[PDB]
Design an enzyme around this catalytic site. Sequence first.
Site, PDB file in Angstrom:
ATOM      1  N   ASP A  16       0.780  -1.235   0.000  1.00 29.67           N
ATOM      2  CA  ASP A  16       0.000   0.000   0.000  1.00 29.67           C
ATOM      3  C   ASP A  16       0.806   1.276   0.000  1.00 29.67           C
ATOM      4  O   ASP A  16       0.156   2.341   0.172  1.00 29.67           O
ATOM      5  CB  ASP A  16      -1.065  -0.071   1.116  1.00 29.67           C
ATOM      6  CG  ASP A  16      -0.395  -0.164   2.478  1.00 29.67           C
ATOM      7  OD1 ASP A  16       0.820   0.094   2.625  1.00 29.67           O
ATOM      8  OD2 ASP A  16      -1.067  -0.556   3.434  1.00 29.67           O
ATOM      9  N   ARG A  31       0.595   6.802  -0.020  1.00 24.69           N
ATOM     10  CA  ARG A  31      -0.065   5.748   0.746  1.00 24.69           C
ATOM     11  C   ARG A  31      -1.503   5.683   0.154  1.00 24.69           C
ATOM     12  O   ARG A  31      -2.212   6.709   0.082  1.00 24.69           O
ATOM     13  CB  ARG A  31      -0.072   6.058   2.222  1.00 24.69           C
ATOM     14  CG  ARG A  31      -0.932   5.188   3.145  1.00 24.69           C
ATOM     15  CD  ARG A  31      -0.412   3.796   3.208  1.00 24.69           C
ATOM     16  NE  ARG A  31      -0.902   3.018   4.335  1.00 24.69           N
ATOM     17  CZ  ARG A  31      -2.103   2.385   4.239  1.00 24.69           C
ATOM     18  NH1 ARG A  31      -2.875   2.497   3.164  1.00 24.69           N
ATOM     19  NH2 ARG A  31      -2.508   1.679   5.286  1.00 24.69           N
ATOM     20  N   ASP A  36      -5.532  -1.265   3.796  1.00 22.37           N
ATOM     21  CA  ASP A  36      -4.455  -1.728   4.599  1.00 22.37           C
ATOM     22  C   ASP A  36      -3.993  -3.107   4.086  1.00 22.37           C
ATOM     23  O   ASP A  36      -4.788  -4.044   4.142  1.00 22.37           O
ATOM     24  CB  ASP A  36      -4.755  -1.867   6.127  1.00 22.37           C
ATOM     25  CG  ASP A  36      -3.471  -1.976   6.928  1.00 22.37           C
ATOM     26  OD1 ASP A  36      -2.356  -1.588   6.528  1.00 22.37           O
ATOM     27  OD2 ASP A  36      -3.567  -2.423   8.086  1.00 22.37           O
ATOM     28  N   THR A  37      -2.772  -3.150   3.619  1.00 19.58           N
ATOM     29  CA  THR A  37      -2.172  -4.403   3.169  1.00 19.58           C
ATOM     30  C   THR A  37      -1.358  -4.824   4.412  1.00 19.58           C
ATOM     31  O   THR A  37      -1.043  -3.928   5.207  1.00 19.58           O
ATOM     32  CB  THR A  37      -1.326  -4.315   1.877  1.00 19.58           C
ATOM     33  OG1 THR A  37      -0.265  -3.313   2.059  1.00 19.58           O
ATOM     34  CG2 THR A  37      -2.135  -3.972   0.619  1.00 19.58           C
ATOM     35  N   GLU A  39       1.504  -5.871   6.869  1.00 19.57           N
ATOM     36  CA  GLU A  39       2.816  -5.265   7.132  1.00 19.57           C
ATOM     37  C   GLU A  39       3.952  -6.175   6.723  1.00 19.57           C
ATOM     38  O   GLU A  39       3.828  -7.414   6.814  1.00 19.57           O
ATOM     39  CB  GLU A  39       2.924  -4.882   8.608  1.00 19.57           C
ATOM     40  CG  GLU A  39       4.204  -4.138   9.031  1.00 19.57           C
ATOM     41  CD  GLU A  39       4.331  -2.801   8.311  1.00 19.57           C
ATOM     42  OE1 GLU A  39       3.425  -1.972   8.437  1.00 19.57           O
ATOM     43  OE2 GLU A  39       5.372  -2.739   7.631  1.00 19.57           O
ATOM     44  N   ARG A  83       3.007  11.530   3.790  1.00 17.54           N
ATOM     45  CA  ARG A  83       2.725  10.704   2.572  1.00 17.54           C
ATOM     46  C   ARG A  83       1.515  11.276   1.839  1.00 17.54           C
ATOM     47  O   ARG A  83       0.543  11.666   2.525  1.00 17.54           O
ATOM     48  CB  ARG A  83       2.458   9.255   2.986  1.00 17.54           C
ATOM     49  CG  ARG A  83       3.670   8.601   3.657  1.00 17.54           C
ATOM     50  CD  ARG A  83       3.398   7.194   4.100  1.00 17.54           C
ATOM     51  NE  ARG A  83       2.270   7.064   4.991  1.00 17.54           N
ATOM     52  CZ  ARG A  83       1.830   5.965   5.597  1.00 17.54           C
ATOM     53  NH1 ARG A  83       2.440   4.796   5.382  1.00 17.54           N
ATOM     54  NH2 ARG A  83       0.786   5.942   6.436  1.00 17.54           N
TER      55      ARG A  83
END
Length: 137
Positions: A16, A31, A36-37, A39, A83
Amino acid sequence: KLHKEPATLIKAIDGDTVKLMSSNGSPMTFRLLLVDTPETKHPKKGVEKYGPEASAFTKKMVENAKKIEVEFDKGQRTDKYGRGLAYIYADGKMVNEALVRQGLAKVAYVYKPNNTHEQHLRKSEAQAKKEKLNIWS
Ligand SMILES: Cc1cn([C@H]2C[C@H](OP(=O)(O)O)[C@@H](COP(=O)(O)O)O2)c(=O)[nH]c1=O
Ligand SMILES: [Ca+2]
């Protein structure tokens, strides 16, 4: 209505987060909005399951595209880390949606007023869940 412009890939960081050369002429870390991908870099939670897969997916998508476009939502354009926050498109395909559709990310960080595509993303997420893909397996 939403502001959209071209950008050039500098480098894919993870599922992401990607570094692009903005229409501005400045290299920026972006971003992806509303997703949410898993971590892959931070010492908390570790290398989450599907992280490497999410990363590979995004990398593939942006590296193979003829054209990359960034689309900002209606509210803030940057987060607290500096970001850029946007919907990224690779040859007119929304990467944010593509990841959700594949169960490689979940809808997350919904901060109004940046939620224009929330319902769209939600539908794709419901389908992925229903098909029991990756994250939802
Ligand atoms: C997607 C998004 C994340 N963020 C922030 C919330 C989280 O901050 P904290 O790090 O303080 O928890 C983090 C999630 O990003 P990552 O998934 O890249 O870590 O970035 C925003 O502030 N706005 C956003 O639209
Ligand atoms: Ca993440």
